[PDB]
Design a binder for this molecule. Structure first.
Ligand SMILES: *[C@@H]1O[C@H](CO)[C@@H](O)[C@H](O)[C@H]1NC(C)=O
Ligand SMILES: *[C@@H]1O[C@H](CO)[C@@H](O)[C@H](O)[C@H]1NC(C)=O
Ligand SMILES: *[C@@H]1O[C@H](CO)[C@@H](O)[C@H](O)[C@H]1NC(C)=O
Ligand SMILES: *[C@@H]1O[C@H](CO)[C@@H](O)[C@H](O)[C@H]1NC(C)=O
Ligand SMILES: *[C@@H]1O[C@H](CO)[C@@H](O)[C@H](O)[C@H]1NC(C)=O
Ligand SMILES: *[C@@H]1O[C@H](CO)[C@@H](O)[C@H](O)[C@H]1NC(C)=O
Ligand SMILES: *[C@@H]1O[C@H](CO)[C@@H](O)[C@H](O)[C@H]1NC(C)=O
Lengths: 118, 49, 49, 20
């Protein structure tokens, strides 16, 4: 019910890794499930910060985490490396900078500013 | 050190503050709710232990 | 598998309150879980629409 | 790169009228 007819958030309930689906197979006096799962692979280190200090305001990721390739900071989804530029669209603001431990200075690009000049 | 990840596959390190931040995000409480009062959360956990 | 290796939405499965994470502890002929959970407190009324 | 793509316009709510 919870894996053939649906997708399960229960960890390792239907196969190791993140559960995608399962396929039932008849067996004598039993049943066999083929648990299809998403297993991450080929990870690499990154430096991270919980939030980014723009001019007096702390920006947090809406979805994903902040990472850097050594010099430039990117926001990427947590379980697959897809870096993107920090913008006001994929981050949200809450409070000033000094309250958060591990805050890092970096510019957050407002997409409206380069779009609007007339 | 890695939270939920070593169950799914290879253990991926992450700072514990960010891990507990997402776990806050998992229960419908935004990350800034944790980061803005991390010290109180840590003190409460230590007192409970 | 569900509380230690992950975070469970199942109510009152991994302890009362909203589940954050759990810690296993060995014991004679058994296992002991320390369910860290988030419980709200200090309510106040509001008008809503 | 994606199979099944179909051409269509996507409207920009940031500038249908709002130019100054
Ligand atoms: C991350 O860095 C540590 C220490 O430098 C190293 O042992 C580890 O292999 C690195 N991880 C990856 C995926 O390269
Ligand atoms: C980081 O990425 C940016 C943009 O892709 C690039 O310009 C820069 O050279 C990269 N730096 C390193 C150390 O990889
Ligand atoms: C991280 O650890 C290093 C070394 O212990 C320390 O110098 C630094 O201040 C720490 N930063 C944070 C945000 O905890
Ligand atoms: C850069 O960060 C430091 C602390 O890491 C902070 O004192 C400083 O004010 C930041 N820069 C600006 C322009 O605010
Ligand atoms: C809310 O209103 C009720 C009825 O007026 C009152 O009994 C209660 O103390 C108020 N506050 C809370 C937190 O419920
Ligand atoms: C669907 O299949 C037809 C051939 O039967 C093919 O021409 C078409 O491109 C396919 N569309 C998608 C979205 O796969
Ligand atoms: C319309 O779709 C076709 C096939 O996907 C593509 O070759 C063509 O370039 C598209 N039209 C425009 C204006 O790009």
């Amino acid at each position: 019910s919870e894996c053939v007819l649906g997708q399960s958030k229960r960890v390792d309930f239907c196969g190791k890794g993140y559960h995608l689906m399962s396929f039932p197979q008849s067996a004598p006096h039993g049943v066999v499930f083929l648990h299809v799962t998403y297993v991450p692979a080929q990870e690499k280190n990154f430096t991270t910060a919980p939030a980014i200090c723009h001019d007096g305001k702390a920006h947090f990721p809406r979805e994903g985490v902040f990472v850097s390739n050594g010099t430039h900071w990117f926001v990427t989804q947590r379980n697959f490396y897809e870096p993107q530029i920090i913008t006001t669209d994929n981050t949200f603001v809450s409070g000033n900078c000094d309250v958060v431990i591990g805050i890092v200075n970096n510019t957050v690009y407002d997409p409206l500013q380069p779009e609007l000049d007339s | 050190t890695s939270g939920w990840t070593f169950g799914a596959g290879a253990a991926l390190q992450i700072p514990f503050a960010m891990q507990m931040a997402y776990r806050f995000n998992g229960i419908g409480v935004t990350q800034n709710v944790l980061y803005e009062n991390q010290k109180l959360i840590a003190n409460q956990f230590n007192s409970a232990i």
